[PDB]
Design a protein around this ligand. Structure first.
Ligand SMILES: [Zn+2]
Length: 103
C-alpha cells in the first residue's frame, strides 16, 4: 500500500468505522479487520484513514495486509502501539490477537 500524504459518526467505535465500509471496493482485503485495526473508509478510491494516528493509505496491492501496512506507514500509532485510546472494539480479544506483540 502507498500512503496519501498530508447519524453522527463516533469513529472511535469499531462498529461505526465498520459502517463506513458498505461501498468498499476491495473484496479480498478484509474490511472487517481493517475497520478493527483503526481505519475508516474515506470512500475515495480505496483509501482508508486511521482515527487514532491520522495515517492515510490507498493503492492496496493484492497481497498486502491491514496491520503490517498500517504499521509500515505510521508505526507510532497509539492504537497499534497499545497506548490508551478511546477505541471501542467489537471484540476486545479479537483486537488483542491481531495487534503486534511486544513479547
Ligand atoms: Zn493508526
Amino acid at each position: 500500500a502507498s500512503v496519501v500524504p498530508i447519524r453522527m459518526n463516533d469513529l472511535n467505535r469499531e462498529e461505526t468505522r465498520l459502517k463506513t465500509f458498505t461501498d468498499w471496493p476491495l473484496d479480498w482485503l478484509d474490511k472487517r479487520q481493517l475497520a478493527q485495526t483503526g481505519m475508516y473508509f474515506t470512500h475515495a478510491g480505496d483509501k482508508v484513514k486511521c482515527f487514532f494516528c491520522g495515517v492515510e493509505i490507498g493503492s492496496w496491492e493484492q497481497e498486502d495486509q491491514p496491520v503490517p501496512e498500517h504499521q509500515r506507514w505510521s508505526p507510532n500509532c497509539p492504537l497499534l502501539r497499545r497506548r490508551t485510546t478511546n477505541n471501542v472494539p467489537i471484540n476486545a480479544e479479537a483486537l488483542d490477537r491481531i495487534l503486534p506483540p511486544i513479547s
